[PDB]
């Protein structure tokens, strides 16, 4: 009903002839972080989390850090008349969460706010508090845990709609995981494969994930020479296969 173990998804059935509908739970994750909500008050509490080391700790650290950032970005706005729509977007690769507000009257008219939780293109190491480095490190670890949760659920729960589902919506998380670990304290080939091939089908992934190949040395060195991202002055990602995909905005809603 409400409660589910962290990172797991549900597959529901729309009918129009039936098509699957993936409930990835990304919207809900983000929403909680924005509200500063604590682990114990989430749909995620009360499962065993030995598979996800430090989930509750890092989640609460991250929850605070996101909450405070939100407040800083919204203290300079008057939002007493307005309501946050149940729509969150993510722009990449800074993991820029974007909210839209509208007046309680309508539901001056609409207002927008963006916070880059994991800024990657333009950073200061030396001129950054411990609070910020600790908050970011916690956000990234939470994202990694979410993905591990996703993968473990996928591995244990075959479904006949798998062949029609892909890791598409997880891309911004994956890109930020890889980007942050690289550009701040190596590249995890699993994360990099999934970020590169956002069209990876679920059944194929399950069968293949454990035999995934490492980053080719020509790519590793092209990365050290030129970044991971290619700015067009719109950002392009430097894939594990040398592809150069455009990282478009993703939109998440409450299920």
């Amino acid at each position: 009903l409400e409660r589910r173990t962290f990172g797991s998804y549900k597959i529901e059935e729309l009918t129009i002839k039936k098509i699957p509908l993936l409930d990835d739970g990304i919207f809900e994750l983000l929403n909680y972080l924005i509200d500063g909500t604590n682990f114990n008050k989430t749909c995620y509490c009360g499962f065993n989390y030995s598979h996800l080391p430090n989930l509750e700790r890092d989640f609460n650290i991250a929850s605070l850090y996101v909450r405070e950032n939100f407040e800083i970005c919204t203290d300079q706005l008057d939002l007493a008349n307005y309501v946050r729509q149940p729509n969150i977007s993510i722009k990449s690769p800074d993991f820029t969460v974007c909210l839209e507000y509208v007046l309680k009257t309508v539901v001056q008219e609409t207002k927008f706010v963006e916070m880059s939780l994991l800024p990657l293109l333009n950073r200061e190491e030396e001129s950054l508090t411990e609070e910020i480095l600790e908050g970011e490190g916690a956000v990234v670890n939470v994202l990694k845990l979410f993905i591990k949760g996703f993968l473990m659920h996928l591995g244990e729960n075959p479904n006949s709609y798998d062949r029609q589902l892909t890791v598409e919506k997880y891309r911004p998380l994956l890109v930020s995981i890889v980007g942050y670990e690289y550009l701040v304290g190596k590249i995890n080939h699993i994360y990099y494969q999934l970020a590169t091939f956002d069209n990876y089908p679920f059944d194929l992934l399950r069968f293949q994930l454990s035999s995934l190949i490492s980053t080719p040395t020509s790519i590793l060195e092209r990365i050290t020479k030129e970044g991971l991202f290619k700015i067009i002055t719109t950002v392009l990602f430097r894939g594990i296969n040398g592809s150069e995909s455009f990282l478009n905005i993703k939109r998440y809603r409450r299920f």
């Binding site: 990694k144 591990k148 591995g155 244990e156 798998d162």
Partner: peptide, 16 residues
């Protein structure tokens, strides 16, 4: 999908 092989990914090298 009742026949599909399951996999345990709990030990994948995911830097957590």
């Amino acid at each position: 999908a009742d026949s599909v092989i399951k996999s345990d990914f709990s030990s994948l090298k995911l830097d957590v």
